Design a protein around this ligand. Structure first.
Ligand SMILES: *C(=O)[C@H](C[C@@H]1CCCNC1=O)NC(=O)[C@@H](NC(=O)/C=C/c1ccccc1)[C@@H](C)CC
Ligand SMILES: *C(=O)[C@H](C[C@@H]1CCCNC1=O)NC(=O)[C@@H](NC(=O)/C=C/c1ccccc1)[C@@H](C)CC
Lengths: 303, 303
């Protein structure tokens, strides 16, 4: 029993973190086989942060402009190239700790574990969700760029995020490991801001099922609702529409608890319209939306 | 910027987890040097869960009654002994992945990272606090016994918790790594229940400072309070008394924000008496008490 925001064990990723320096800028790199991946903005000066032509800046760089340190071992860069907003630094040594891995891009509403790093050394690990507006609500200080987000399936690491920047609202923006940004953000200095966010309805329902599995039942009721009547209420409260695919995805949790999905939707409608009246669910006074149905099943296996 | 419940990187501990079987019971063990540590209740049958004499049960056991598997490598047990509520199984091989480590017992109000494991294999990592009533609010299913809690300082792992059981309220109980329980709990089947808990006041104040550092300021006010007038209110709301040592410990966060500790106490008194009126702090609608002053400083270094 119990339900916590749980990250994947970080060991396999810790073995891939290195330190990358160019000029006076130091950040983190990801060392897989004989390539080190890092944010391309490592090559910029703050004389260049305004309208950097990254192509121009990179043609002016050489292999020896990049210092890569793995612990207290210097790796020799023997090649460099740009892949969208990430740099690929070919080094003379394959990482002996390379796990089985994939580069996957995730969807808004999906979760992943972040290994926050500074100077190539891991600091902590926590769980994030990709928001509908393609930001993440993380914990990142200067020097954290190049920290990565990931999921593990059996013992294959699916890397899905590399950290690049913080927005004025305090949320965070980055790329997949092919260097393609999540969302309409750019690695150049603008007034860029997060677009309007919404609540991930299917996740809130998943977390309500987690609560039932863990013995929190006070929000349940007799009522059921139609999918269309629910979505009418969800729209009003800045919740994403619930699709029939979402209903299908919640099937296993519905079966385990004996609570039909549209029954739980009726509980959610009442929570949205009346609040909790000073009660809590799984220790929270807010409806939580950063647990996927998978996060719930994986953690609530046998309560 | 940003503030998250952050765990320590788990790599150093993942390398120490093994699987321990005795009879039909399998749980997790911690493999350090040539010793494997696990809960002594591994030797019990459910014919014995009522009033086990652990001394009696252990004298009837032999080395070959204990199967220890490290990945897909069998370790030979060459010695066994009881240390309070933990078993020490001497094995024929020192763990080559043994980190620098300490066995430390923590205080209520302190935090640590838990590496949840099943069958010797890590599942996830999350942060816990030791509650004033010596329980922890974790996420543990059957098979998780022997999972450990820990902190890291530089690259020394201070193990502080081994998991033994779940209470009827859904909270969790265990021992330090010397086998001594936290709290008045026993590894035998009783009606044992958690005593009454309280809120960790110094941690709530630390988290309010974290919020200010991260730009949440709406709860601040002009008022200051005396320590005694604050503690009068804290008592009324099931908060622990604030000591002058607590005030001193909050010094660095007070200096960084320019907000005197007794000023923040006045904010807390008002929050306790009036609630938040539908606002949130660092994403929470409740006052959070599972971040220590250290957790805040370490994470909010340079905002
Ligand atoms: C790389 O380590 C940093 C990480 C940032 C630093 C600020 C604190 N939190 C982080 O995640 N990346 C950068 O410094 C990039 N720029 C920004 O993050 C922009 C911050 C900002 C600018 C203007 C208004 C509000 C906020 C640099 C590399 C440019 C892409
Ligand atoms: C070891 O893996 C388990 C872990 C438990 C199992 C239940 C689910 N969550 C856990 O943490 N330890 C035990 O099974 C011990 N007993 C209990 O946890 C008691 C559960 C309980 C009993 C009576 C009323 C309410 C709850 C065994 C080994 C006895 C110490």
């Amino acid at each position: 029993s119990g339900f916590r925001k749980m990250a994947f064990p970080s060991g396999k990723v810790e073995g891939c973190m290195v330190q990358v320096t160019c000029g006076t800028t130091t950040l983190n790199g990801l060392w897989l086989d004989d390539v080190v991946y890092c944010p391309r903005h490592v090559i910029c000066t703050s004389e260049d942060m305004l309208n950097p032509n990254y192509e121009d800046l990179l043609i002016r760089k050489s292999n020896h402009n990049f210092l890569v340190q793995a612990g207290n071992v210097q790796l020799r860069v023997i090649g460099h190239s740009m892949q969208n907003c990430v740099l690929k630094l070919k080094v003379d040594t394959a990482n002996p700790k390379t796990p089985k891995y994939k580069f996957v891009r995730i969807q808004p509403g999906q979760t992943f574990s972040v290994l926050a790093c500074y100077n190539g050394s891991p600091s902590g690990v926590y769980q994030c969700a990709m928001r509908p507006n393609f930001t993440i609500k993380g914990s990142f200080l200067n020097g954290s760029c190049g920290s990565v987000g990931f999921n593990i399936d059996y013992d294959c690491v699916s890397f899905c995020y590399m950290h690049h920047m913080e927005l004025p609202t305090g949320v965070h923006a980055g790329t997949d490991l092919e260097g393609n940004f999540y969302g309409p953000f750019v690695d150049r200095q603008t007034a860029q801001a997060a677009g309007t966010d919404t609540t991930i309805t299917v996740n809130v329902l998943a977390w309500l099922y987690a609560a039932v599995i863990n013995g929190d039942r006070w929000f349940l009721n007799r009522f059921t609702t139609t999918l269309n009547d629910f979505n009418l209420v969800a729209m009003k409260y800045n919740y994403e529409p619930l699709t029939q695919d979402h209903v299908d995805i919640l099937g296993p949790l519905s079966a385990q608890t004996g609570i039909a999905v549209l029954d739980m939707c009726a509980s959610l409608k009442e929570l949205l319209q009346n609040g909790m009246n000073g009660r809590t669910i799984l220790g929270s006074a807010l409806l939580e939306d950063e647990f996927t149905p998978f996060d719930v099943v994986r953690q609530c296996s046998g309560v």
